[PDB]
Amino acid sequence: NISENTSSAESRIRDTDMAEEMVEYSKNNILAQAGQSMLAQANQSTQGVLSLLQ
Amino acid sequence: NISENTSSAESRIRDTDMAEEMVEYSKNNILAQAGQSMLAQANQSTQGVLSLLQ
Amino acid sequence: NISENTSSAESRIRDTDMAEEMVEYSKNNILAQAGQSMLAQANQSTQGVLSLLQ
Amino acid sequence: MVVQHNLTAMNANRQLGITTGAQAKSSEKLSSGYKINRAADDAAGLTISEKMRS
Amino acid sequence: MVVQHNLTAMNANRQLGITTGAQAKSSEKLSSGYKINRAADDAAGLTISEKMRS
Amino acid sequence: MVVQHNLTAMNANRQLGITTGAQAKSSEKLSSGYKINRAADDAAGLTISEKMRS
Amino acid sequence: QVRGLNKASDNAQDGVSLIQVAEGALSETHSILQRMNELATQAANDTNTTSDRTAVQQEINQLASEITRIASTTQFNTMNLIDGNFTSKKLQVGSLCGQAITIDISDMSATGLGVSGLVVSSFSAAGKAMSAAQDAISYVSSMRSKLGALQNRLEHTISNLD
Amino acid sequence: QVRGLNKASDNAQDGVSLIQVAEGALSETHSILQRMNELATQAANDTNTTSDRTAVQQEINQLASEITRIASTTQFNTMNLIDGNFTSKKLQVGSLCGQAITIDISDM
Numbered sequence A, B, C: 001n002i003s004e005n006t007s008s009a010e011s012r013i014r015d016t017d018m019a020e021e022m023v024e025y026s027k028n029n030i031l032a033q034a035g036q037s038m039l040a041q042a043n044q045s046t047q048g049v050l051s052l053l054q
Numbered sequence D, E, F: 001m002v003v004q005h006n007l008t009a010m011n012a013n014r015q016l017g018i019t020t021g022a023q024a025k026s027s028e029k030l031s032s033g034y035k036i037n038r039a040a041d042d043a044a045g046l047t048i049s050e051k052m053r054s
Numbered sequence G: 001q002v003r004g005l006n007k008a009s010d011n012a013q014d015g016v017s018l019i020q021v022a023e024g025a026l027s028e029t030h031s032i033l034q035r036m037n038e039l040a041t042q043a044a045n046d047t048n049t050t051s052d053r054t055a056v057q058q059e060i061n062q063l064a065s066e067i068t069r070i071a072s073t074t075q076f077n078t079m080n081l082i083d084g085n086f087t088s089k090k091l092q093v094g095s096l097c098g099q100a101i102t103i104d105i106s107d108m109s110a111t112g113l114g115v116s117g118l119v120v121s122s123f124s125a126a127g128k129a130m131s132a133a134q135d136a137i138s139y140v141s142s143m144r145s146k147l148g149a150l151q152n153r154l155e156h157t158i159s160n161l162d
Numbered sequence H: 001q002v003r004g005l006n007k008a009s010d011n012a013q014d015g016v017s018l019i020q021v022a023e024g025a026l027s028e029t030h031s032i033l034q035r036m037n038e039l040a041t042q043a044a045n046d047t048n049t050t051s052d053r054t055a056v057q058q059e060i061n062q063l064a065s066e067i068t069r070i071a072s073t074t075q076f077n078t079m080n081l082i083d084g085n086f087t088s089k090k091l092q093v094g095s096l097c098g099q100a101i102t103i104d105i106s107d108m
Helices: A002-013 A018-043 A045-049 B002-014 B018-049 C002-014 C018-049 D007-032 D043-053 E007-032 E043-053 F007-032 F043-053 G002-044 G051-073 G123-161 H002-043 H050-073
Strands: G089-092 G100-103 H089-092 H100-103
Touching: A002 F043, A018 A045, A018 E007, A018 F007, A045 B018, A045 F007, B002 E043, B002 G002, B018 C018, B018 D007, B018 E007, C002 D043, C018 D007, D043 G002, D043 G123, D043 H050, E007 F007, G002 G051, G002 G089, G002 G100, G002 G123, G100 G123, G123 H002, G123 H050, H002 H050, H002 H089, H002 H100
Parallel strands: none
Antiparallel strands: G089 G100, H089 H100
């Protein structure tokens, strides 16, 4: 019984909540897709210099 | 519950609305091209001096 | 018996009808997908300015 | 059109928000299993349900 | 027209700067995912968001 | 623009790093099944837990 | 006007968002009072001996402290929301001077609901404690009925200002 | 005539633009009245005891304060549109003296 309660205590502290962590994972999979999107647009941002009488 | 509602509160302040900001991003994106076009034509504008009895 | 009836009464007032609410969920899931489509089309819709003697 | 205010997009953004609102207020009823989560849903349905719960 | 100072081009330049200043303030919010990246965006909103993060 | 220094992109590279870093620190917990894999995650979470494991 | 209406929309959402913190705290005040009423109903029965009503009283004293802990501790942006002192507070709900909506929130402490000192050591007092906790469910119903009706003004306000 | 007709065209758009603010504000007066009807329909039922009809009444008062807030607050160019003071206001929709259209809005 003390083993089941102190297992329940350590699983509180240290096992992943896979429910919660797949929220935090999927925020980041979207932000990485969005960051790669902005970085892809940003490398093409200064393409605007070249028309400029050159 | 309070953590959820004050996450919702801080998100409503600080997170980028990726829809509403992509509206404003894309105005400025077209204005930069329109302004680079208007500057590219502005540097051509005074070429009209050169036919002037020279 | 009064408990089974007043439980049934409260459940009529307050438990989600999951059948009905998954209609109203899936309306909004399509409308959000269609609204994101229309917003994504709308942001590109003023790309028409740039051919215009520019 | 105007380059400075994509009102086609701004209205589409305003309507996308109204729709993701209705989505987050529906998804709440399915994750919880209740039709009145907050007294903003039904002030009588709350007040009566707390008497039937009582 | 004066040959020595192309004032139409200096206006177009000075308006191009104001436009790509606004464009970098947008690109920053999309790439990071935060509306308020720095205290110049909302001093009240940075302050309240830190008390809510806290 | 400055042609030599795409700061719109350098900030986006930098914010992408914060994002894909946070993603690998999340992905570790789903692949391992544990919340504290490394004592850097929670010094008391680790220290308490090893006494509960013991 | 556009800049001001966008702050008015942001402030009406900062109002909805505050209201939800108060409303969602009183949701556990209900859930504590639903438990105090059920505990009082059980302790009222004179098949209970003395030790087995002081065993109920230990949970009623602890749950009354928890209603006061919900009250003094729930905050939004460091302001207490249901201690009785969120009164005369205003939302700037438009572009002009003083286009208010008012937020007032009666005290939701165990004293403010009369559940401080529910005494359940006899049928007479444990019925007195049923009466008190059913009035407190009726008070938290009436306060959540105001905070709910108010969130419905602001959802209409945000739909309007936008 | 052309210069005048172009201010006339812009004044008819300042006219359309004003109307859309009022026609938009009354679009939430519908959302509020559709809600007040439905609340009143719920409160008519003689299963509600007194404490449940005061719980309805809190919203039927708060929402009626809202219909007055929409009316005394919706403005265009600092003029109230639907408080009942937007009576007899003339748009000039041509090049010549008094080629009017009249905007006239009852109290909402």
